[PDB]
Amino acid sequence: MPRVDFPRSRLRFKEKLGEGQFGEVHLCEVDSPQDLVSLDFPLNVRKGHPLLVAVKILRPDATKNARNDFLKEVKIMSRLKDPNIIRLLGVCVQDDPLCMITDYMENGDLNQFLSAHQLEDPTISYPMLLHVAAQIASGMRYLATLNFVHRDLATRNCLVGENFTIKIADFGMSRNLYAGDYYRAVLPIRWMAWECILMGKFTTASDVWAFGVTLWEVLMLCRAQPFGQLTDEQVIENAGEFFRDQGRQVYLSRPPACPQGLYELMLRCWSRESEQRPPFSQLHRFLAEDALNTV
Ligand SMILES: Cc1ccc(NC(=O)c2ccc(CN3CCN(C)CC3)cc2)cc1Nc1nccc(-c2cccnc2)n1
């Protein structure tokens, strides 16, 4: 827990960014942020330009369980300090409504960003795609070593900062744009390892599987939904085929930009056995070294 609340009186409402069962996320401008610049709030103020933040707000009539989960997220976010994980800027928890505040990325989520680019034969290069993926692996290494499981890794849950910096986040199913990526609890089945779908087992190994699918998205420049040839019920059936291990399971195809070795990395992320999936330390090393060294 942060020692002092961010002053709610400085948050100027701009836009509603999303909603869920227990609250909303708003885009706010911080009024006169130079007044707040301190050790507690080391805000990056650009004179002449508004300071924008995302604010997650718990409904004041939230249940006890909803409130506890919100405070659990506060506690988790207060620990996360890595260049490739979204940073908590402040909280409002002394009074209702409870709030968490992070930076707002004008470049949007990584899906939005890659969707707006084309592959260099605006453009983005294959080496930059590897850098994006390496950053995600590095953030995931950090999370896993702190004994967190993400459970919803995908390009839609990564934010694009300045100079191609990628921040892993977790927004939940709070945005209409990605409703088709979730199956009705509400689950991102196309990113989920077979054991998640069949047994509800979520682990770092299943985060690795999701990382494989996220890497696939990146190399596809977010042009195709994973398993777009399959209905939701068929995706669940595909998980059964991984369980069966009789060679009928469908794997995502190799993207045109993806060399065979990188594709085989992805296939290893989709190993039937968790213990055969590469750790994030290895995924990062492969992307930052092996793949980048073989352009
Ligand atoms: C305002 C806020 C409050 C909380 C969070 N929280 C997280 O992003 C997050 C990240 C990692 C974890 C780790 N956790 C481990 C356990 N498992 C099960 C889940 C994940 C938890 C929360 C983000 C935000 N930021 C946010 N939220 C929604 C939209 C945007 C946003 C949208 C567009 C551009 N810029 C920002 N930004």
Residue numbers in the entry: 600 to 720, 736 to 798, 803 to 913
What does the report in the manuscript say about this coordinate set?
The discoidin domain receptors (DDRs), DDR1 and DDR2, are unique among the receptor tyrosine kinases (RTKs) in being activated by interaction with the extracellular matrix. A single transmembrane helix links to the cytoplasmic domain, where a larger JM region precedes the catalytic C-terminal kinase domain. Overall, DDR1 displays the classical bilobal architecture of a tyrosine kinase. As observed for ABL, both type II inhibitors induce an inactive conformation of DDR1 characterized by a “DFG-Asp out, αC-Glu in” configuration.
The DDR1–imatinib complex structure was solved subsequently using data collected from crystals improved by microseeding procedures. The structure was solved by molecular replacement and refined to 1.7 Å resolution. Disordered regions in the imatinib co-structure were identified in both the KID region and a portion of the activation segment spanning residues 799–803. DDR1 was monomeric in the imatinib complex, consistent with its size-exclusion profile, whereas the ponatinib complex formed a crystallographic dimer with an additional ponatinib molecule bound at the dimer interface. In total, imatinib forms six hydrogen bonds in the ATP pocket of DDR1. Two target the hinge region, including one between the pyridine head group and the backbone amide of Met704 and one between the aminopyrimidine and the gatekeeper residue Thr701. Two more are made by the linker: the amide binds to Glu672 in the αC, while the carbonyl contacts the backbone amide of Asp784 in the DFG motif. Finally, the methylpiperazine group occupies a hydrophobic pocket between the αC and HRD (His-Arg-Asp) motif and hydrogen bonds with the backbone carbonyls of Val763 and His764. The DFG motif further stabilizes the binding with a π–π stacking interaction between Phe785 and the aminopyrimidine group. The strong binding of DDR1 to imatinib was revealed by isothermal titration calorimetry (ITC), which indicated a dissociation constant (KD) of 1.9 nM.
